[PDB]
Amino acid sequence: GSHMGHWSQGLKISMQDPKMQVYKDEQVVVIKDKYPKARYHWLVLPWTSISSLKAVAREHLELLKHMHTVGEKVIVDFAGSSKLRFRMGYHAIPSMSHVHLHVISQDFDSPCLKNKKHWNSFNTEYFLESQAVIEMVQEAGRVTVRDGMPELLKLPLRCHECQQLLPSIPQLKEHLRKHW
């Protein structure tokens, strides 16, 4: 198939789709995640094209902080009264091109959350905190990740609230109901 039509380039299409945009300014766009892994799941993307965190440098530090601030604003404007806990961050190894900040509520109540990679990508070291990425770019000038990130996706399923071990995705999803 074509490069532009490849599944890994899909965000470059969605970020220009008015029906998926919930916020726009002169630097970034916020879209709904096409396959949300919780009740609230947005992606903050800059207009300018940066393939991944591998291409981030100190020239992008202001942009990374602005993305962080816009994510917090969206949380207030769209889920302020819910008082849900939120996390913001990046996957240590992304699948989709174009740098994007995850903004996801911590219910993880979604039919799109279906497999172990989904869970561990948001609930292990694989999920890089936005603040940690920002500080790493500021102090070290680039984003580096340790070896072994793919193995983290294979870890046993463990609740993020009470750390209880669960034997399967369905049993995990049922357990998460208890923390609503």
Next chain:
DNA sequence: GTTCTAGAAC
């Protein structure tokens, strides 16, 4: 990244 589904796990 998602779908689809073969067969492993239960």
Next chain:
DNA sequence: GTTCTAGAAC
């Protein structure tokens, strides 16, 4: 027999 996971996708 059904649930559940995990690899191909030309």
